[model samples]
Target: KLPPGPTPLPIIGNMLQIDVKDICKSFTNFSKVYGPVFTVYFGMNPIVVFHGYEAVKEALIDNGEEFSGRGNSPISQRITKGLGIISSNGKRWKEIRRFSLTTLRNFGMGKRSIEDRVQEEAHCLVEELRKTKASPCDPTFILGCAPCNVICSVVFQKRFDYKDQNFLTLMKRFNENFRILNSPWIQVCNNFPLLIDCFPGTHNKVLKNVALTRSYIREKVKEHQASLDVNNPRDFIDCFLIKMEQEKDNQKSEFNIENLVGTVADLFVAGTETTSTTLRYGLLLLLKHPEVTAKVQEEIDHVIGRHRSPCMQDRSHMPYTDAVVHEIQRYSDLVPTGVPHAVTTDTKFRNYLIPKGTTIMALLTSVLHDDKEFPNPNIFDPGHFLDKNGNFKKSDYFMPFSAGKRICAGEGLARMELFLFLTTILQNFNLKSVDDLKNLNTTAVTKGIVSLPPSYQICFIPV
Candidate 1:
């Protein structure tokens, strides 16, 4: 039996009953009335929502296999075409994921070995900021450029200049893709695809963005194909092509050219947005809390000093900086509702019998903001991740990227990027918020699948 929820109407189902603008808050409120495991409909499709730490953990972690499948929504199906890691399931999903992890590791994803790449990009970012000479300016574009270039290095084996028109367009398209994908009307269309197709909306724009993005990736792949050296793969695409050649004899292989495109798109799109947004948001939070910013700088000065750029090795020695980074992630609640997951087999979670192929969301907002796990969960306090002695404290609830089998493949890269980029910036420049601290708009300017701080300028005074 499924847990109870607000009554649904025919065709429309429960869509009208809840607020879609704030999906996380809406779902959390329902959990209070119906308990943790509950059913709500998007049109006629029933989505079993898992709310709170206990309920989400029990489903996504304890009963992981049953919930490991990625839910194929109409919107996602159109975008990914059942080919990529983010949208694929079963055997195909497994192969791509395993290969991607192995390949990314070979490219130095989680290890400290990748620090040089991130540090080099950080230097690029610092140089860009130095041009401003502490003048009040928005850091979003410059911040976005570095991470996108990092992805370029991984996926295409080259990085573009920050001022390159083509590079800017690709990043802009990515921003549009995320914006449209998160729009409420897009979700509404996701529910009533048959009805909403009568008239187009942002969903149409999203498809256009996807097409342009794919075109760019397709061109890059061709460039690599021309110079591919089987024994000496330069990047991810080369490794994937080598795998495809080796698996050519196997009829069951999923490593085809189409998958190569989709997988690269997944890595590039995902890799660009998460790290860049987190780094951007981290800087905003630091500016908003000058006292905390001062403390972070004080810690940076004490540990790394005012010389060479900060690296991964400096993280352990700078506990306060580490705690602040963790807190920024927790407080930002980026990707509040994670990419939805599906039931691989009809299974029971608590008293509810979720059917196979049912779309279920392991709501990350519930885990990130659980008051039981962190005191004053709604507040942005570095102490949440710090021990009483002021050393960095680790919490299982720090799951901004999510948890378990389907946790973000780019988790390690994002962590390394945030730490290195933020420390490098603070090491050389003091960030001064354009707005008064009390008057600052800490609430996300845009909120849906991703949360971004409003456009705000900062003066990066030289340290």
Candidate 2:
């Protein structure tokens, strides 16, 4: 039997009691009354929610395989058609995810080549900011551009100019889609899948945007296909195409154009938004706490210095800067509820049995903000991840990327980007908030799927 939760009414289930604006807060409140593990109904579906580090760890880590399946999301299904690594389940998911992971690794995801790409992008970002001449400007699209370009360099073997029209449009679409997907309307539609067809909404625009993106990917795939060099794979698409030829004779093979498009779209979309938002939010937090910024800059000057670019190797010697990055991720708590998971098989979890195919939400927000691990979790303090000796302290609860078997595929790449980008910017310039420091709002503008920082301008004054 499923764990007990608040009573559900017909049609709407327990959604009436939920604060749709902030589902994390609503689910957290429910956990307080129902304990860590409980089931809440969304429409006719029952979703098992896990809160706090212990419960989440138990479900996602200890019971990893049993809970490894991708959960239902109508918006994602409509866009991906259950073909990509993010949306697929069972054997298909396993194959695509493994292949994607291996391909990313081979293409230097966790290696030095990718680090060079990020550093190059970081230099480009510094140049872009330098052109602004310490004038007040929003870092949204500029920040977005750098991370997206890193993905582009990896996936397409090339990065676009910041002024490239196609690049700008693609970024705009991703931004708009993220905003719409996190909207209350889409959340309701995701719960009640039928509503997507029953009513006209912004979700349709998401569909169109995805189609355009896929079309672009398809064109690129075709270009790669025409220039067939079986011996030399240029980038991700080439690698995938080579794999497709190898698996072409196998009828049950998951390598196909549709899966290719879907998976590429997944990598591009997933790789871009989260890292960019984290950087954007992290900068805002630093602006709010200038002392923290000063300390980090001091570390940058001491360890990395003014002449050289910050690097992965530099991360080890700079404990304070490392702690700040960890705290930024923990405090920002991006991907709050996380992409939902599903039980792959009928499994006994704790005192309850979560039936196969039941949706599960492993709340990252709860774990990140759990006061038990970090005292005064709400405050922006790097000391949370630092010990008395100023060494970086590791916490099992620091899972902004979630944990276990289904952890984010790009965790390594994202970490490198965050550290490099933040350090590079701080090393070259000091952040000056456009508004008075006291009045600067650090609260997130959107609390849906991702915690988006409020839009603010900053002057990147040369240090």
All candidates: TM-score: 0.95, 0.96
The model with the greatest lDDT is 2
Q: After superposition, how far is residue 253 of candidate 2 from its true place, in Å?
A: 1.2
Cα lDDT of model 1 by residue, 226-339, tens digit? 998887677788889989999999987999999999999898778887888888888888988888989988988888888667888889999999999999999988888887
Off by over 4 Å in 1: 106-113, 198-204, 445-447
TM-score attained by model 1: 0.95
Number of the top-ranking candidate, with TM-score as the measure: 2
**Model 1, residue 45: displacement in angstroms?**
1.0
**Cα lDDT, all candidates:** 0.84, 0.87
Cα lDDT over the full model 1: 0.84
